[model samples]
Target: GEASTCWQLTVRVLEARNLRWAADPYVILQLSTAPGMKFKTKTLTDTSHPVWNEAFRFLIQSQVKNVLELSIYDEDSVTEDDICFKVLYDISEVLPGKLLRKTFSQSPQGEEELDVEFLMEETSDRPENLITNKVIVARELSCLDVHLDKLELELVLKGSYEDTQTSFLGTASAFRFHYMAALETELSGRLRSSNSAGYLTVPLRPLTIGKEVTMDVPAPNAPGVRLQLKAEGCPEELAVHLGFNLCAEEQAFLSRRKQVVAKALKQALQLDRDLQEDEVPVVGIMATGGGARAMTSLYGHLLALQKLGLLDCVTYFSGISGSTWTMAHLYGDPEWSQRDLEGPIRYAREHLAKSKLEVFSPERLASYRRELELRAEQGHPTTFVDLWALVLESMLHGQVMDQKLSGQRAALERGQNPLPLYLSLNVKENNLETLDFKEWVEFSPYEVGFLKYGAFVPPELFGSEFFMGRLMRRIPEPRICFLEAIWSNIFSLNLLDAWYDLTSSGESWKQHEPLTTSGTSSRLEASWLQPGTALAQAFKGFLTGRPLHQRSPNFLQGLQLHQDYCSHKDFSTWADYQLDSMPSQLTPKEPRLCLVDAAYFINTSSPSMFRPGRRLDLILSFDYSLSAPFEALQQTELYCRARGLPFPRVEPSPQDQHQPRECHLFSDPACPEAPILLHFPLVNASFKDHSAPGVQRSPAELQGGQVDLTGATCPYTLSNMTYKEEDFERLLRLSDYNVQTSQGAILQALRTALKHR
Candidate 1:
């Protein structure tokens, strides 16, 4: 080692090529000296060509021509790290005041490439360029370049008929009947699973031998490797297409959404730099829960957004309780615009307004219970959600059905629609009797996990527990219908003690806490929590303290992506499913989460909207809860404050809280860093009694503004709200009008927020 001199080295780290997955990839740049120093680039998750066109400056010793050491590493959280590639360069190998760029290959001749450039700045010429020492500012540098591409698919067919037992006049028998009988076959193999796409059609005179038909097939995630057949035209009939159980990678989707919104904002705001290509804001919208009463407002709000060209800017769409019904209906058809939702709204309201008992006939109940029993047999936990979904599906589809959320996976994959997310809280969160803290868990087609921890188990492995990175028990994904029931149900009960102790080998749960909140002893006295709730009805599953428990298949199960990392946790139940790991010990071992309506929490859908992962710059919350107008907003604000997140004052003046104007914008000097929230409440002053004050309007009124003061959902409890067909139509129209009239305010909020960003 010789004496140190001063030289500034500027290195341009452009991008990598053919980088692999399995571990998050980041580059490590280090200059080799006696006092070694290293700098690392930010990790590029789940991608190959990570581009960081950053400039890194380093001070070096001119006396001894040291070598610059470059390496790429796969950052593994669970185990020791391994270098994917490494390169070294001697200082003498470079020219001064000129760029010397080079491409370095991975170690052991790996296919990945690392591109870097070196330009030596003035050597100790001035204080500005001098670090005063050889080992200064040895940290990572940064820049970004993004590109995305997708594969488009199409199919064509040509066929001819083969003549069999057909004479010239005999053809009339087959054609005279005038029937369209379908001919279908399937392709079965290892590479491609069986699908009913291969069909043969024949024609051409009466002299055909055998039918011949050919059709193109859709491809899988892997290019040109496997041909997967997707049902054409009809999105509803498509098979449940569940992919690898994985968390939704919103990062890439958000990136693309920014580009879209950036272009749109530049046009609307009529300014280029306000939403420049370099930076774009993330926006999320949420619909609140209010039984069927929320449907109208939710529909209208979305319709207005779509009409104003603002729908395209939303990256995530979330709902709870009745609002979720709108989400499900709208997403059923990938091609349907917000305008097309009116049809389903009418259909859904007619069906949903009927009594639950109408669809809960003995046969239907037994059939639904039988389905629950089957799930129980599989070692999966069952709840009221399972029963609720069965009943609702029966009510909605006219029977207990096999319709699955998986049906929407393809449409979600298309990226042509905003992502759909729903909220379900663990009952332990709401039941005041339990010290176990509450948690807001999100259920998406992509994954299900606690929002507090930001750790998600893939949708397929949401249940079941893992220890030491291995599955100790295996449970199947609870059917999507059951999950929906969980989100939509408003019922709550003594869940943890009843379920946990009852399953603990002949244990009893009664002594844990008084059955009723007021310390009522007898069963007859306990059912009086609310008007609609009876002791037997509300506490059916817990009364006996006998949980229907079953053991899971005794095998090690791990369908998890080993590399999917969240916050500081892995995608394993060992990290996500434990009660001790939760903020307040939210559940016992391997929690199944008592699914209640999210309205019981803050009714606003901010649980999913404000996820740190979404990186949202603004949030649009549509509040339709039938209670105090600003209660949900206040609750959400408090929740955010308690979590140490940045937020603005949400409490309106006492009078304003009761009577909120159409739309209220809550912002602070702390915003932009803190999310800007625009809240719209269901108020009558703006619409001028267009339907009726707090009345469910009929179609006549909805269509022609003929207000029906008598048409009100008077039994306005959160559990269930009764409405006539006409009422629903009016609500839809009323809601549409609400947004329709408040566009100026909404637009103003959006523009103002964008300007701040």
Candidate 2:
């Protein structure tokens, strides 16, 4: 045998169904060499786009068997394909005198099934039997549905007297579908007349989806694994057999930030944690203050921690900061649901009544007084606070865009706002009397939502991380967090209007460059923690947490995504949304982020929007409001009485329902024809009709809220819209133009900056 050792053998492959789902509708494959030839599956096709696959590595393994059996296989409980076989053992088997020829070859898609082959003399007599190549066969008869009037626990057969049925057996006469196992004491049964597969209604236990959750079985050793329910509707005759394979952790992943970490904190705070003494101390992170107000950002940080993707090894947390302006503008009592101490109210009454956290911060009290004073000084207007919220909201929108797009390898095709942060500042004209850098980029109508009725619904609501987070939380387990506000810092300003008078007329400050970012960041961190800042700091307080340098990139990326959403004029492509969709258990790092001024309208008119002919009404109440009970109050109250809603009952402290903003419906478009566009002066986010007529739940299954998410639609009031450089130059040449007229920095400076960007 050692004299001439060029040993060789042949391989016999059966019908190979090369169908890879999401990778290749036509499957891809691979083969092995003669020494120890091993076969493998290469790729599967993606739905719609057959060329691409959704998996990381696209190959399956094979074995060194002499004879391999093969068949087509349905990729999933949701897939189906068929199988067949052929044999090719030795080259001599095909050659005239058994003469050696080509190197080696075997067809992956051979059609014939028992095609003979010459086996090597060294091979056993039953060589073909020993060669077992797991040929995956197409599962055409795959069952996915069973009609049911109502989902219940008890068996409700849709089938009738007779039908042909074949099932996999665990033993003598058993059945198994993936993880599903059913053992019938009766050996077998036949499908009778009418297919006997008529539907049934059974009380259904809420089985989990998106993850695996096992169901216990009493069918002896036949426990059934959960199956996925992908197909939409079930017919009466189809026996819907589904097994749910819910990943418990993935289920928790939806709102894993809160449900896992936040819940853990709640419990750990309420009860002692069970851990070994040698373990790290339980560290709880409370993302309070306004800066952490962006729910998705906050949640992203928490999730990053869970996956060990960030620096902070273990993260436990306190919930987010909701809107206090809602309380201040409407209720007049900051202590309602919006106040920081509201949560502490219960705890104070029960546990730490005397605690500082339970009491209103000094700064908050001052702000409340200031609110009252503002009402006293100038006739109070509800639009005051709402507009203020809008300004911070817009800036936030910009910052988010900055975070998501900067420093990326490739600019996302569907990006929010392609520009930088310093660019999106709310500026009317380049004539600011302040300092320099004022007259740069201009605003546009599409920046916000469409303006249908008179009022404006800022486009800022499109990517509102807070509002979306709230709605998502109501679901089983929301993957994201909703932050109504983000407040980072609030330095004491002695004057009412700081931008105009508080600081020294400042060409001096810029020259000094005295404003080191670190000093400011440190001040912010201290302001929120110990003996400082209150319920209403500045916008910084709204989004408070750790500084970017101190926190993980994952946390920051979510923030960027929020901003990108606000500035974009289109829907983010599939890739943008998938970046951080799943939860991980790795060290926290910055995740790739993005933003884009997206699809401007909610697109409700299309049948695909939500089936056809569904009416959607967004109300916009006529606007007007004030703070105190003087002549201004009388006039405002008169307006309120005219609406038949009655004037505010409590003068100093009103109920939440009586707030003027509640009555100020900024957007009211009752169009089922198309997406109703609401517009306004500022580029912003969510605007509710305080004067909404009535709430109806006609379509219970229909999603409650709707948003454009894109900023494509241009509204009627085209104020502060796009500006052309040429047009501006033409206007300037015609007039005696001073660059520092409204904002600052004339056309010359603007041209320079434009060129630089």
Candidate 3:
């Protein structure tokens, strides 16, 4: 068993002497455990010998080897600062409640020296508890006998009262205040008279089991003024839901959808009997992303599945990036699966072939601005993603979409279609790359949530404010177009890359590489499509240094991390390794969520399919990636392995790497719990030679087979919004053909899954 203790460390920079040159000096302090957290002292101008006398505190863990890093720098206004000296101090040497003072010489012979003091104290492992502290502003006495107009009491932390509660004295003489606090929190009081002001600061000392305390704090400036305050520690417990299980709504939906799936499987597989409730293996289809190409290909794949009478056999249909476009469009019609898909297929064709230039027209840009402003007025954090959503609305539907995600519940009322789950990646604001940190956030008709946290909220309440597992504010649910923008915000990357390419010294844009080799052509096209580039540049001032990802209120705000959170099963396995040990840096500490397209992470919706309660037995993976067909699967396999989740191994033959077949089967017989993967890589395959399974096309009509998948001529590139009529037909037919031709593999996987069940 691992034993650990929490400690609070206070470091004071006393003074520096015998400097080499006249310099504006400042000091920076950081903890080795959390490099992202740093503290800097005020700079003193033209002073080689500077005295900061400033103290900074940090929470440290005993289980980890901790080090205090201190550095002195010469401040420079016009250019980068110059480093004076640096020191690394091990914290284990200092005992609790003992003060350690040390003087450091720049070198053995050098005269430069610095003085610092360190104080460490053991602190409660649980930083926050349910105990409520009732504070009352009893009365205030003015020094000049002036009538006190107003008085306010507030809690302050590190000079910021953002998360603290404040109480004001109205006509009623006394004010009652209730607030949550940690052990070391401080309470501050401010008093105002006609022409005089006074303030008091007091640390919240722990009270006896159930005792009340009173104190009369006098203000220094206003010698005769006194503020009377009363505080009582009333211990209480808050019951918050923190279980790792499927929500009641999702569980019920799965129960209903599984019945539908069982019945559909019987018909699709030509089975003589219906499957029992327990025997119906959970089946899901995961679609990858590739901008317009992904959208069109997903439509074709679904069309072929419908033709094969296998669409209804699926219990879950998950999508990421462009694939979400198809899912959103289809689910809009409740009876989409029951109806002939030709109508929707033609609808997609029309939109895919339409010119996207109008999306950047002056009228459209104005509408985008108006819509963004409206959202901002409604307390929404409007970013480039919102603007992209408006542009996407014009390009996809050519008008505002009144449809909301919760509205799609109509489609699943009777389990008529698979439950649609859109996937996005929540990344760190400062760390834009998904490789640094990414959490899977799934959006469904019923709810939107982070499976990693086992925390969710109703779809309509996603953007609303939540505190301590309770709703604080109810913001209006955004329309489907906004969510669509989140699921496919690849355009944001394009805009930034293009801007960097034009303004940077060299080709700095190359740093933001696309997910696949074929994606290069699409990115090139994005750079050439100057309309989006021009508009993005027009908002350069507003966009510069601003986060491009969609920002939504975090539903887990104000939730405290359990004392043993790192050892809890859910957190031990599911939490981000880098953050799990640091409770102060966990997701619950975040005020807003930074959600972006999952394409930035893995370009696959595989994580949604891996939700524990889903118990998926067979995953039909539709790879709509531009190239490197097996990349998403490989990344997902690695992801599953890292999380200790069961996943089929993905190992394509060397020959298949260059010219992948339409379909491949992957599974691990050793790990029976691992789902069978029926991966359908988007490829021409035999469709290039034989139009159908074995039907050959005449020489004159053979031109239809010439779909450029990996070249500059590829019409279905990620950035190509408009497709030629022939190009549209060829891509649609090719995807449909690929699925149709792979019926043998799909049937085999399903039968095997049923047999296992």
Candidate 4:
């Protein structure tokens, strides 16, 4: 048996006195414990002394400290007003079932004063009422003077259980009723003449327990007449899932994936004997985003791994932004790893070499508009991301795709391919800076969820409506194209800024730094460079007053936050210092989720690989960024240190800054739980001189080795959506050659991890 008491505090602001000229004053009331719930009085104009007899009520628990805050402000029509004075009073001073009146002065010498009263009452837990058998009675009805002066009113309650009614008579202005029955009940107030001919009927809704319902019901027949009715409801049960741990589905997937990894390790390591399940070390591949550069480079890297017989040794493959494009394409085929990757590579090359302007054709634009309208009709909130998704689908596939994220389960049915996780960041709508506030959201074929809160839903139920852990409305599952747009929304202005700063200069990395400075300016200097088309005009019209982030109905709606939610292990252990202190502004109170690309914060997908449930023993980080090769790894280190998670310190030497090697091994020998990191910066070390291992390029073929990466004429900029055949082949071969040359280090790290296990 759980029981608790809540104190209901009633405050009344009576009036103010003395002469304060040019003052149109208003009083704002708030409680310290519940800052989100506030009340304010009407502003009085052209008065030295204002009178506001306003009363407000608030519920506060006795277990915590509560303070009443009252602030008086002068109202201004054109500018922000000035605060006259503020008073903070402790509610504990007032005893239960007692009233206290006090007068407060603005200054000791001034005669300006304000009078206020506070009353406290202790409310105990009320017993649950059986709404299955109840009566709904109409107490009073008013505001009916449009018709006759005298009339009779009837209250009717109709339901499957029974039908009941009561009669009362009064003038057309008002009537009093002392009448009421059952589940699924419909309550209505009917107006009639003395002869009992119906003139108007006001239909009401079902009721809840121990609460009074009030509404202004409009008269359909009487045109201008409106009836106000107050009814007493003698009527509700609830359950919710709240926790911080890996869900059952994910845990089971991990179990099944480990077996595949163990067998793969034995064969890839050329061992004569099979290894035990416990001996299999969790290895993951994390790829960053850099527009088409990332997408093409990832395909080359995965192909190289497959050739080296090392692809099957991995358990998880997580990507962000452009890298996700490769993952989505490969996973579409169930046996992508079992066969040669030449077909997909050719397909990607063909699309990457085509002109991107065709995506904005009139025919395609019409299709995009129709698709978005149909999705909105299906109850999925439409935004600019939807438009981008349609554009991306045309750019990548050139046709409509019905594939969903959940459809990738076919590839993982027998644990043949690595479990794919797409990364995105949930941010506040008003705050676009990821450093200020961000929560990690992971998407898999099985489910999508937030790492901060251990809440998840099936991939198909993502855009659906939920209330109190129950599905309220079922929305059709969105295609994977929309999710692709969300995961890599390069349309964001911040993302463009980060990219510009990173590729411009060496010191510009500090300007785009995270967790330290707020140097970003709010200026719209960059504009979209699109061809003049009808769809372009339509897109600009939709961009008016809209932010470039996807908004979806929050699945955690109606779930109340715990009083000590900050003290929970999930928050205290992995604390987002800026948000952990303010529980009232957390995600549970938010009506919708604002999600954007993780590249807007960091270009790497390392956060998803760091989840405790994954328990990865080794991570292969392939950084596809243009410049600042070690920046993402250093930022991840800072992120882990702030959250108290185990991460190897990333301290690249000064020499590594200018000329980075192909692969660098970083590990914390002191901490056993820290995973060994193999960092591969996109540097053409040996591949710049030699085409293959120890095979120097001839004078005629030397042009292929001199691929520009960070120069002004570099073909692999973040803004470049298409690439020439030579540029595309050079990038692919360069990425593949880098991974192939690092085979020694990869095998060494794998052997070390296996030995530790």
> lDDT at 239 for candidate 2?
14
Using Cα atoms with residue i matched to residue i, what is each candidate's TM-score against the true structure? 0.54, 0.19, 0.75, 0.74
Residue 278's lDDT within candidate 2 is 25
Best by TM-score: 3
lDDT of 4 by residue, 167-265 (tens): 333434543322111122245565554433343444432223332344433333442234545444321221123345566666777778788788778
Q: Write the per-residue lDDT of candidate 1 for residues 315-425, one digit (tens) a residue.
A: 788888777777776776765453455576667777756655444456765676577678778655554445556555665556544444545555455455677888876
lDDT of 3 by residue, 1-757 (tens): 1233457888999999876573899999976444335689999988899999999887655544455778899988898998887877767788889899989787779788889998999775643223111100001000100122244444343311133444444543443333333223445555444354444565553221223334443333444433455455422322223446777777888888888888888987899887899999888999999888888888889889899888888999999999989999889999999999889888888876776754566776677777767776867776768777877777788788799898999998888889898988777775434345667788999878877666677788888876555565788888898999899887777766655455634322223423345544347464335545546645655556555778888887655454445565555556678655555455765778888887776778987787768889999999987668899899989877887888988989898797888888899978889999999988887988878866888898789898878665667777778887788888888998899888888888899999988
Ranking by lDDT: 3, 4, 1, 2
Best by lDDT: 3
User: CA RMSD for every model?
Assistant: 21.5, 29.0, 7.7, 9.7
Model 1 residue 355 distance off true place after TM-score fit, in angstroms: 5.3
RMSD of 3: 7.7
Give the distance in Å from residue 480's predicted Cα in candidate 3 to where it truly belongs: 1.8
Model 2 C-alpha lDDT per residue in residues 463-563, reported as the tens digit of each score: 32211011101112100111122111121210112222325433212210011234331211221233232433443333222111101011111111211
Better of 1 and 4 by TM-score: 4
| Superposed model 4: Cα runs more than 4 Å off | 1-241, 373-382, 431-435, 492-545, 694-703
Which ranges in model 1 have alpha carbons more than 4 Å from their true place? 1-248, 263-278, 336-339, 353-357, 427-436, 469-476, 492-596, 689-716
Q: TM-score ranking from best to worst?
A: 3, 4, 1, 2
lDDT of 4: 0.70
- Model 3 clash pairs are none
Task: Give per-candidate clash totals.
Answer: 11, 160, 0, 1
Q: What's the distance in Å from true for residue 235, model 3?
A: 13
